[PDB]
Design a binder for this molecule. Structure first.
Ligand SMILES: NC(=O)C1CCN(C(=O)Nc2ccccc2)CC1
Ligand SMILES: NC(=O)C1CCN(C(=O)Nc2ccccc2)CC1
Lengths: 304, 304
């Protein structure tokens, strides 16, 4: 029992963090096989960052201008390429701690663990969501760039995020491991405003199931609703619309708890319209939307 | 920028988790040097757990009745002793992944990362507090016992918690690594009620500093207070009393932000008396008390 915002174990990812230095800029790299991945903006001074021409900046850079350090041993760079907004640094040594891994471009609403790093050294691990506007609400100081987001399926690490930018609003943007930004974001220090930060409706409902399973039930009511009816209330509250897919995904939690999905929707409708009245659910005074249905099944079943 | 409930990297601790089986009971052990540490209640059936005589139960147990497994390799048990509420299983192999480590008995209000494990396999990592009533609010299913709480200082792991019990109320109790329960708890399945769960005042104030540093300032007011005055309001709200020590510990955050500690106390007094009025602080609708002053300095400076 109990429910907690839980990160994946960071061990397999700790073993892949290196320091990448180009001139005066140091940040984090991901060492997998004989490739170190980092944000291409390692080649920018902060001045460059106002209007960088990455192609022009890169021309001036040779393999020997990329200083790659793993703990207290230096890696030889035998190759470098720009893929989208990441650099791939070919080193002469395969990372001996390379776990099984994939690159996956996640969907908005999906959750992942972030290993916050400085100078290739991990400082902490926290669980995140990709917001519907493709921002994340991270904890990232100067030198945190190249910190990666991941999920783990038994022994395989799916890398889904590399950290690049803090937006002027203090939220975070970055790329998949192919270097493609999540959302409309660019590795340029400019006015980039994120859109509306909507709540991940399916996640909130997942977390209401987690509550019920863990004994927090006060918010169960005698009402049901329809998807159309529920989505009228969702709209008003900047909740993501709920689809039959979302309903389908909640099926197992529905089944286990014996509370139909539309009944819980009607529970959630009342919570939105009437607030918590000073009560909490799983120790929270607002509706948590950074647990997926998969997350709740995982934590309430005990998958390793 | 951004502030997050961040666990220590779990890598060094992942490398020390084993499976311990005695008859039909399997749970987690901590393999450090040539000793595996586990909850002594590995020797209880759930029936025993109603009124166990650990000395009598242990007599029936030989070294060969403790099955210790590290991934898919078995460890030979050459010795076993009962220290308080833990078993120490002497194996013939030193854990080759033993990090630098200490056992430390933490103080209430202190925070630590928990690596939730099942069958010696880590499922997730989350940050915790030792509550003032010496309970923790964990996420622990059947087979999670021997899951450990820790802090990391650069490369040294201070083990501070081993998980033993879920209380009838769904909170968690367990021991330091010397086998001494935190609080009045015993490894017996009985009515054990925890005392009042007071809020960790110094932690809340630390987290208000974190808010200010991260741009959340709406709750700063024009009032100050005294320790005595503040503690009258604390009492009423089941907040731990604030001492000159607590004030001293907040000194650096005070200094950095230029907000005196007693002014922030007066900010917190108003938050207690008037609530959040539907506003949030660092994405929370209640007062967070599971960041220590050290935690806020760490995360707002970027220590690895
Ligand atoms: N800006 C540019 O035109 C270039 C593009 C290609 N390039 C490489 O280093 N390619 C390479 C070399 C050795 C092994 C593997 C790959 C440097 C940058
Ligand atoms: N219940 C009891 O009287 C005993 C107490 C001592 N004991 C041991 O196994 N001691 C031991 C043996 C070999 C190497 C290291 C330590 C078993 C339990």
């Amino acid at each position: 029992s109990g429910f907690r915002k839980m990160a994946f174990p960071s061990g397999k990812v700790e073993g892949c963090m290196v320091q990448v230095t180009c001139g005066t800029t140091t940040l984090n790299g991901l060492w997998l096989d004989d490739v170190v991945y980092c944000p291409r903006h390692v080649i920018c001074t902060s001045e460059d960052m106002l209007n960088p021409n990455y192609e022009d900046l890169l021309i001036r850079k040779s393999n020997h201008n990329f200083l790659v350090q793993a703990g207290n041993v230096q890696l030889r760079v035998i190759g470098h390429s720009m893929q989208n907004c990441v650099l791939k640094l070919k080193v002469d040594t395969a990372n001996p701690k390379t776990p099984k891994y994939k690159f996956v471009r996640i969907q908005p609403g999906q959750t992942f663990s972030v290993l916050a790093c400085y100078n290739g050294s991990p400082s902490g691990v926290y669980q995140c969501a990709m917001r519907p506007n493709f921002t994340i609400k991270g904890s990232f100081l100067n030198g945190s760039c190249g910190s990666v987001g991941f999920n783990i399926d038994y022994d395989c690490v799916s890398f889904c995020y590399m950290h690049h930018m803090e937006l002027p609003t203090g939220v975070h943007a970055g790329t998949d491991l192919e270097g493609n930004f999540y959302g409309p974001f660019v590795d340029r220090q400019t006015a980039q405003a994120a859109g509306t930060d909507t709540t991940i409706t399916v996640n909130v409902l997942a977390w209401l199931y987690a509550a019920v399973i863990n004994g927090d039930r006060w918010f169960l009511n005698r009402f049901t609703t329809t998807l159309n009816d529920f989505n009228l209330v969702a709209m008003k509250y900047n909740y993501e619309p709920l689809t039959q897919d979302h309903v389908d995904i909640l099926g197992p939690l529905s089944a286990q708890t014996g509370i139909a999905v539309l009944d819980m929707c009607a529970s959630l409708k009342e919570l939105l319209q009437n607030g918590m009245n000073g009560r909490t659910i799983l120790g929270s005074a607002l509706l948590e939307d950074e647990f997926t249905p998969f997350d709740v099944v995982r934590q309430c079943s005990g998958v390793t």
